PDB file of C-alpha atoms in Angstrom:
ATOM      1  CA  UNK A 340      -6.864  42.730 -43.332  1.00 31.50           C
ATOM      2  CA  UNK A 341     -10.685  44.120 -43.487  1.00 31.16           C
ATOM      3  CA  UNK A 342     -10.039  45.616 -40.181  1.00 32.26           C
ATOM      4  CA  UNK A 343      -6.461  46.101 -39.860  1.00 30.64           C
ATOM      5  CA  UNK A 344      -4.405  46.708 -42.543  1.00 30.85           C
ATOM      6  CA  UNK A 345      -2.265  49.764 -43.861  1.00 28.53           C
ATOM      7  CA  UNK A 346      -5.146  51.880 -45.959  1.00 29.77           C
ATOM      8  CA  UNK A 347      -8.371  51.469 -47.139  1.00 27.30           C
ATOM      9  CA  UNK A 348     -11.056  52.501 -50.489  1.00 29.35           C
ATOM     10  CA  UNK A 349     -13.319  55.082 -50.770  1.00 29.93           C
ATOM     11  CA  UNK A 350     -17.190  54.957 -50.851  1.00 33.61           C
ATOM     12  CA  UNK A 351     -17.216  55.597 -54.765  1.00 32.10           C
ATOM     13  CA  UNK A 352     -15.031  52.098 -54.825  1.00 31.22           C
ATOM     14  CA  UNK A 353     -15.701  49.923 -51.933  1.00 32.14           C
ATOM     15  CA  UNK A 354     -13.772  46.897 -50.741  1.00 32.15           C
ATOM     16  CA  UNK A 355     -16.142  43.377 -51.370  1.00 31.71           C
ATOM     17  CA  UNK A 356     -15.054  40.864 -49.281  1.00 30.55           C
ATOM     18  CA  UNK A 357     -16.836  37.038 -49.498  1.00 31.79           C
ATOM     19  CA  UNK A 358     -16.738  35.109 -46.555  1.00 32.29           C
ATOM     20  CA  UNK A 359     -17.532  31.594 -47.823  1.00 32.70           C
ATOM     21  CA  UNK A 360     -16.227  28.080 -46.603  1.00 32.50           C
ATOM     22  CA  UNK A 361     -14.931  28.974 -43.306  1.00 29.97           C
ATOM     23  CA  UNK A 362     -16.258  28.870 -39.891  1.00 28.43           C
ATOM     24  CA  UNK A 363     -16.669  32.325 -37.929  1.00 26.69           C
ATOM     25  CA  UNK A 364     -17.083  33.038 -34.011  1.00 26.71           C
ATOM     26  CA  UNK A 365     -18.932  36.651 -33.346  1.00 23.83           C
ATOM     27  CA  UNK A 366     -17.918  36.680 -29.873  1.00 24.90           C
ATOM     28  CA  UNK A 367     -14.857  38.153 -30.427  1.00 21.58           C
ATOM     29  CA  UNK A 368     -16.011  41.442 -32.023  1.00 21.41           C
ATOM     30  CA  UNK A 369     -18.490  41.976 -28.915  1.00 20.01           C
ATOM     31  CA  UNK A 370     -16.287  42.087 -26.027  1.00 21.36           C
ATOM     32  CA  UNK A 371     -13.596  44.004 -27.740  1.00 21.17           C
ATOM     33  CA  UNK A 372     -14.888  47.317 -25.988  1.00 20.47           C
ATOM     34  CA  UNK A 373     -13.038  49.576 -28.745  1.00 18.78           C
ATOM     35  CA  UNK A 374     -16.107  50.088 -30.884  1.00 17.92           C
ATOM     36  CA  UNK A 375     -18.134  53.559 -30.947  1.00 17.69           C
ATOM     37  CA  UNK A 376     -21.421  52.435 -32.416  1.00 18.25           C
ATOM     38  CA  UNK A 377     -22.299  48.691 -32.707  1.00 19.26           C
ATOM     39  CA  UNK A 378     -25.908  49.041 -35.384  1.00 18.41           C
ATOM     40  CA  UNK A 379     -26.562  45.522 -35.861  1.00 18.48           C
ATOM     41  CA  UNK A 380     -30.605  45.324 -37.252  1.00 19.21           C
ATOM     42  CA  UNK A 381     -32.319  42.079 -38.575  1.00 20.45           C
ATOM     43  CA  UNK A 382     -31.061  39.950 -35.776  1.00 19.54           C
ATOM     44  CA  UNK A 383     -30.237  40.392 -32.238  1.00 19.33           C
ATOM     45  CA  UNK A 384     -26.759  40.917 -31.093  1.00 21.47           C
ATOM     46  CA  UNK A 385     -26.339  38.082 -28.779  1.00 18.72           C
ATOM     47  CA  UNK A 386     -28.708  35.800 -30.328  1.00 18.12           C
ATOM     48  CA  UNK A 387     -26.672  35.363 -34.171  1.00 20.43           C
TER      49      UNK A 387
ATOM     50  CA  UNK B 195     -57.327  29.468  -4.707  1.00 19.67           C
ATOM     51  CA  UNK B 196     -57.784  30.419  -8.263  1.00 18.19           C
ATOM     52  CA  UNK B 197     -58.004  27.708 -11.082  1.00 17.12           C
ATOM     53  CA  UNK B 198     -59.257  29.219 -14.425  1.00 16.93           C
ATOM     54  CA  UNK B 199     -60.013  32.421 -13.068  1.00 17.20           C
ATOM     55  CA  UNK B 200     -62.364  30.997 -10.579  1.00 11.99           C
ATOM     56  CA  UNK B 201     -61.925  31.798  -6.863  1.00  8.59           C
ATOM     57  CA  UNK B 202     -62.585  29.037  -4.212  1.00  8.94           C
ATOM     58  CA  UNK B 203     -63.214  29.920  -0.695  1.00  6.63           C
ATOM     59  CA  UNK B 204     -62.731  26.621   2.375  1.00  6.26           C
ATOM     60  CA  UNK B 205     -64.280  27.726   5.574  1.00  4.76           C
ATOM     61  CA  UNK B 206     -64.375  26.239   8.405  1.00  3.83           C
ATOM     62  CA  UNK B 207     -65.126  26.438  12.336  1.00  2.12           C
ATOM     63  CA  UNK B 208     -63.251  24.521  15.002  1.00  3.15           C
ATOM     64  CA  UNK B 209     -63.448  24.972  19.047  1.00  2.00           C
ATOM     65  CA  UNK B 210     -60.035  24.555  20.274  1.00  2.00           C
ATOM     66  CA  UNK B 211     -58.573  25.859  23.689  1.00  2.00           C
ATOM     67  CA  UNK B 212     -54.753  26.346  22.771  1.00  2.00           C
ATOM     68  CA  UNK B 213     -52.361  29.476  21.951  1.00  2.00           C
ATOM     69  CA  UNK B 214     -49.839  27.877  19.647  1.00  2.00           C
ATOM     70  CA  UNK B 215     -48.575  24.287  18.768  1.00  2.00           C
ATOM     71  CA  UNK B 216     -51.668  23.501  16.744  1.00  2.00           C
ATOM     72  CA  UNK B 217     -52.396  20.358  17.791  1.00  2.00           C
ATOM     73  CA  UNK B 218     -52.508  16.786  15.212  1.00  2.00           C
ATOM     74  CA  UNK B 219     -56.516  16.675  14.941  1.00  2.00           C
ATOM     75  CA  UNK B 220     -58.329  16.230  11.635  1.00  2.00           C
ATOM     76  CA  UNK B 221     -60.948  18.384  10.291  1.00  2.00           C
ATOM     77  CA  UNK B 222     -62.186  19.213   6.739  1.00  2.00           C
ATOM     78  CA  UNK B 223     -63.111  22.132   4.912  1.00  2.00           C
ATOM     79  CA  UNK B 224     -66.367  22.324   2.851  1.00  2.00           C
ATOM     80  CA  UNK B 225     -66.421  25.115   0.610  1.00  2.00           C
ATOM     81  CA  UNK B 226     -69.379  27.793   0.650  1.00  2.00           C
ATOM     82  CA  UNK B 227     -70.138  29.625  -2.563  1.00  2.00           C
ATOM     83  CA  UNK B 228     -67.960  30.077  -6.615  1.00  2.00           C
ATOM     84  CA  UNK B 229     -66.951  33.137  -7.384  1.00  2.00           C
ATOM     85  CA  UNK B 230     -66.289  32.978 -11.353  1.00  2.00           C
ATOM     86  CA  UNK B 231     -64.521  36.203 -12.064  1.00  2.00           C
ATOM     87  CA  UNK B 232     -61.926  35.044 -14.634  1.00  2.00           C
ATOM     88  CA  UNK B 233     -58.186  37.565 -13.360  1.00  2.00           C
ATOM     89  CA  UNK B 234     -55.261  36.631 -12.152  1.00  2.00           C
ATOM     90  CA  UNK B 235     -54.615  37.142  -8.860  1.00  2.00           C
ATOM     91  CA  UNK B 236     -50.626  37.501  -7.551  1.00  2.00           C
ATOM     92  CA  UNK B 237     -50.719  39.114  -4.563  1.00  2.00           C
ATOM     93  CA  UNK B 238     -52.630  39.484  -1.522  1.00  2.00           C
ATOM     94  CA  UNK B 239     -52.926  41.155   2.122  1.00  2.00           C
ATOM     95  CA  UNK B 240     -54.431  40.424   5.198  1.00  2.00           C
ATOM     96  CA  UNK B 241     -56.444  43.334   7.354  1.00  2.00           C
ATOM     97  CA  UNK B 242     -56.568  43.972  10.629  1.00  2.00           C
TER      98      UNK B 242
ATOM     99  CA  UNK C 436     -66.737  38.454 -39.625  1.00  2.00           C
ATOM    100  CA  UNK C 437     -65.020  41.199 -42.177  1.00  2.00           C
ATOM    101  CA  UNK C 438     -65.746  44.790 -41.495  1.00  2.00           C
ATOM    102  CA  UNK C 439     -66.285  47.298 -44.647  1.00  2.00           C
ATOM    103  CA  UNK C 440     -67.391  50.466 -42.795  1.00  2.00           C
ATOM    104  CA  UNK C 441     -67.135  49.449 -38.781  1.00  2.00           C
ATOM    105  CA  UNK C 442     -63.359  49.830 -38.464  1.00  2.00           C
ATOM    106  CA  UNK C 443     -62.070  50.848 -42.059  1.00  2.00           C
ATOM    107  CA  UNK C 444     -61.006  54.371 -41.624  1.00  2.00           C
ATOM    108  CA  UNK C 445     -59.604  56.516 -44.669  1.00  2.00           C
ATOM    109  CA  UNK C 446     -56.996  58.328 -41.954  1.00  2.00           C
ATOM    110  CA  UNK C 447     -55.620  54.598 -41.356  1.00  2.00           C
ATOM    111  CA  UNK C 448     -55.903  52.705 -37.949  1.00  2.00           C
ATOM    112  CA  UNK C 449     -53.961  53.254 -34.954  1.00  2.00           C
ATOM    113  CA  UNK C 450     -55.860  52.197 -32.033  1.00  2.00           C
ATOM    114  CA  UNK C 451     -55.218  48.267 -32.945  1.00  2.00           C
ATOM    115  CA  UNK C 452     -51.424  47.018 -32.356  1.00  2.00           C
ATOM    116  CA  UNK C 453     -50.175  43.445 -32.711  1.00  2.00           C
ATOM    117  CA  UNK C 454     -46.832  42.764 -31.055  1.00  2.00           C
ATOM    118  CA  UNK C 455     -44.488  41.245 -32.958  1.00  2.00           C
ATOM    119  CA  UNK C 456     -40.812  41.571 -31.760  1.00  2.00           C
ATOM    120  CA  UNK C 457     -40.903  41.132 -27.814  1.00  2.00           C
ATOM    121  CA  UNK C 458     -39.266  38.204 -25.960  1.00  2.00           C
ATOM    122  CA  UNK C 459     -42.344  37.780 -23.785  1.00  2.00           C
ATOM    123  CA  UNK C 460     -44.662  35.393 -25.363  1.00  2.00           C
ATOM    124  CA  UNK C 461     -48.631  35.318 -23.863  1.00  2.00           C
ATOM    125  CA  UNK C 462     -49.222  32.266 -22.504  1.00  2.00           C
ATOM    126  CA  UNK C 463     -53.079  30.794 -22.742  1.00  2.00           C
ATOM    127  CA  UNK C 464     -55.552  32.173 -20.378  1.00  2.00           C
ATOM    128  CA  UNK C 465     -52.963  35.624 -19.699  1.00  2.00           C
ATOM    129  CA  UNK C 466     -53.196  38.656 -20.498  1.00  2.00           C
ATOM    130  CA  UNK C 467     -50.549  41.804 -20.813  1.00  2.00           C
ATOM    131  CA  UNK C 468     -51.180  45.222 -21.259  1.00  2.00           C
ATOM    132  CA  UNK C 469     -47.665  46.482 -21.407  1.00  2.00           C
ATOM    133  CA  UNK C 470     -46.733  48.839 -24.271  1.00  2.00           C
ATOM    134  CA  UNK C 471     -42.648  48.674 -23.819  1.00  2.00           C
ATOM    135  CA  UNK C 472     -39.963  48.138 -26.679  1.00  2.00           C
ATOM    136  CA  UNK C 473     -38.082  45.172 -27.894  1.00  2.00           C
ATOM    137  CA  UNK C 474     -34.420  44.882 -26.409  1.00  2.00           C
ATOM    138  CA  UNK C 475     -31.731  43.580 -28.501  1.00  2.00           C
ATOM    139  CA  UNK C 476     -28.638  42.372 -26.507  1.00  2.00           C
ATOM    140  CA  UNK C 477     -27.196  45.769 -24.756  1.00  2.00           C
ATOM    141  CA  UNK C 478     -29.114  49.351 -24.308  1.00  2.00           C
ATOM    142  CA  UNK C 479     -32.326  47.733 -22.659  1.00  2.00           C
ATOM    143  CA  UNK C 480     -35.117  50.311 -23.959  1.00  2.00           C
ATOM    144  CA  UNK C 481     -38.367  49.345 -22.245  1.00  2.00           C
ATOM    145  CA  UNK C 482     -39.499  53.026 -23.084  1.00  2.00           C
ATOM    146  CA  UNK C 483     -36.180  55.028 -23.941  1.00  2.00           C
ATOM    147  CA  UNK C 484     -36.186  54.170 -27.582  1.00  2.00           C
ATOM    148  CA  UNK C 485     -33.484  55.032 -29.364  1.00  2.00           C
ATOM    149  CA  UNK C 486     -29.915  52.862 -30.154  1.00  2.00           C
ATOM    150  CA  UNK C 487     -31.106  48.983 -30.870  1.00  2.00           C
ATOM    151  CA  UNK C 488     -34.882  49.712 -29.792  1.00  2.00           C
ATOM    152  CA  UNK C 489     -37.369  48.238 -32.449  1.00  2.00           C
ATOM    153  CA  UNK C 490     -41.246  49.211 -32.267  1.00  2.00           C
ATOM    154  CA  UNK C 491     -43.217  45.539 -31.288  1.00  2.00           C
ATOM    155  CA  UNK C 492     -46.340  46.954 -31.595  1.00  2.00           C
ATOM    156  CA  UNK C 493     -47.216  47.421 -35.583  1.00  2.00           C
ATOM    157  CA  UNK C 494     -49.457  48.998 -36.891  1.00  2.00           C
ATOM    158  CA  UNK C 495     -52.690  47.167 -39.049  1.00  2.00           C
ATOM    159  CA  UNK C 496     -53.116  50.569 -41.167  1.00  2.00           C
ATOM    160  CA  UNK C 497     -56.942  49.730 -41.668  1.00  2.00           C
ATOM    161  CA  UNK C 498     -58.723  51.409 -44.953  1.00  2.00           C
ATOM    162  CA  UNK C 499     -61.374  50.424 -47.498  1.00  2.00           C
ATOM    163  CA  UNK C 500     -59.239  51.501 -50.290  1.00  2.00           C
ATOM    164  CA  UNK C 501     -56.867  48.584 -49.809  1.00  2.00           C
ATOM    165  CA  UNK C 502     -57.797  44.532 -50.811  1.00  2.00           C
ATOM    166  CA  UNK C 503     -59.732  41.626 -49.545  1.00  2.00           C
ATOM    167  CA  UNK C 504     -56.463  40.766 -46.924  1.00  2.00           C
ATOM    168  CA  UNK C 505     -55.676  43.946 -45.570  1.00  2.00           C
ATOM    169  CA  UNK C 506     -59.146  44.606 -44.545  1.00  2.00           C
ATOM    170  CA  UNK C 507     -60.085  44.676 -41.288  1.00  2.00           C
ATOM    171  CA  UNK C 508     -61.843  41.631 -39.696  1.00  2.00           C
ATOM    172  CA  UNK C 509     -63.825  41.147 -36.324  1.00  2.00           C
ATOM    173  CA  UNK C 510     -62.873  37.971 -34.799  1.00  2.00           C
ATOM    174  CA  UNK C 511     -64.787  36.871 -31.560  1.00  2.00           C
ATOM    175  CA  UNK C 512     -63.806  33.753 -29.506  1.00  2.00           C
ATOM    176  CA  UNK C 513     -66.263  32.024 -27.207  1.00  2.00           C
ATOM    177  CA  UNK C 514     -64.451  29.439 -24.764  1.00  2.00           C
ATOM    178  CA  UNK C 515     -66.452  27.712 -22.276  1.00  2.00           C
ATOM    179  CA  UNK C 516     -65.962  24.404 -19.836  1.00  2.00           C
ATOM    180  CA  UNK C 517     -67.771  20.993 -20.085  1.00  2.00           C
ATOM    181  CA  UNK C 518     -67.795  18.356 -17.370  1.00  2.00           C
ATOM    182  CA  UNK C 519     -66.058  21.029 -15.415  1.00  2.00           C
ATOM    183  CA  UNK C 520     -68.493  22.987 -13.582  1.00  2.00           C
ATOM    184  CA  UNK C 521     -72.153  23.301 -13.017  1.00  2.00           C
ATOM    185  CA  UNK C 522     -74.396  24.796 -16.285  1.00  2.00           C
ATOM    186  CA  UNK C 523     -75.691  28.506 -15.338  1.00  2.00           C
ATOM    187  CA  UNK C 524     -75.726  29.479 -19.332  1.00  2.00           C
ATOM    188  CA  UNK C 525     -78.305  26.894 -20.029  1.00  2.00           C
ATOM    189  CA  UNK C 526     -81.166  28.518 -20.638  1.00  2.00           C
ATOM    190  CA  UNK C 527     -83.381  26.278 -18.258  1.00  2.00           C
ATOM    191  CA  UNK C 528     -86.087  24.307 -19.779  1.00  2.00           C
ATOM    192  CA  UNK C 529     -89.575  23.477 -17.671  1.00  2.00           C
ATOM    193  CA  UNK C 530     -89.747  20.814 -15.336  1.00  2.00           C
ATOM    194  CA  UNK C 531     -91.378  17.612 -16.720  1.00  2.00           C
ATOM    195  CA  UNK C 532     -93.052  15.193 -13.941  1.00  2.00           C
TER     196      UNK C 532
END
């Protein structure tokens, strides 16, 4: 629903999502090859 | 060969009568002179 | 050994850099003089700069207006080899009978 859903907020009013007690996999959202810019700083891309 | 930066140079002459098929004789190599430079060294030529 | 007027500049420091984000660590008795930039995953920079290309080589920002730990400081190591090889830094003494 944070990526696909039917609308979404503004910047004045933001959606907050917590992502707490539940495992997550990253290597989906790299090879999806539908993203325009992929700005990921702090850590390295493959190495998270 | 180069251990610590130091080059080490093994001459030595041999009379032999022969083209190719080196024969099975022994004979050692007493090095000449240290040559402390302190590089690394990773690739080398031969001049004719 | 700190320095208070050999290297602390009041237009800052530039001609020191300390690398900080590349892969490539320096193994003892190496030595690398290559001024590239840090690759993260895709886009590999190595001089392009520009999308996911972060700058390894920071700057130290030397000058005598700052404190005691951002001054600059002159650090010389001497390495040498016992049992090893023979003396030639000695510093020969006379020959007894």
């Amino acid at each position: 629903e944070v990526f696909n859903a039917t609308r979404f907020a503004s910047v004045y009013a933001w959606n907050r999502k917590r992502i707490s007690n539940c495992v997550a996999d990253y290597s989906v959202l790299y090879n999806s090859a539908s993203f325009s810019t992929f700005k990921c700083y702090g850590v390295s891309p493959t190495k998270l | 060969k180069n251990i610590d930066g130091y080059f080490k140079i093994y001459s030595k002459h041999t009379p032999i009568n022969l083209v190719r098929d080196l024969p099975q004789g022994f004979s050692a190599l007493e090095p000449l002179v240290d040559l402390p430079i302190g590089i690394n060294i990773t690739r080398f030529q031969t001049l004719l | 050994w700190n320095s208070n007027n050999l290297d602390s500049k009041v237009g800052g420091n530039y001609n020191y850099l300390y690398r900080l984000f590349r892969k490539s660590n320096l193994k003892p008795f190496e030595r690398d003089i290559s001024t590239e930039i840090y690759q993260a995953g895709s886009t590999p920079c190595n001089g392009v700069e520009g999308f996911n290309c972060y700058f390894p080589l920071q700057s130290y920002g030397f000058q005598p207006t700052n404190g005691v730990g951002y001054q600059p400081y002159r650090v010389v190591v001497l390495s040498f080899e016992l049992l090893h090889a023979p003396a030639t830094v000695c510093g020969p003494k006379k020959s007894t009978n």
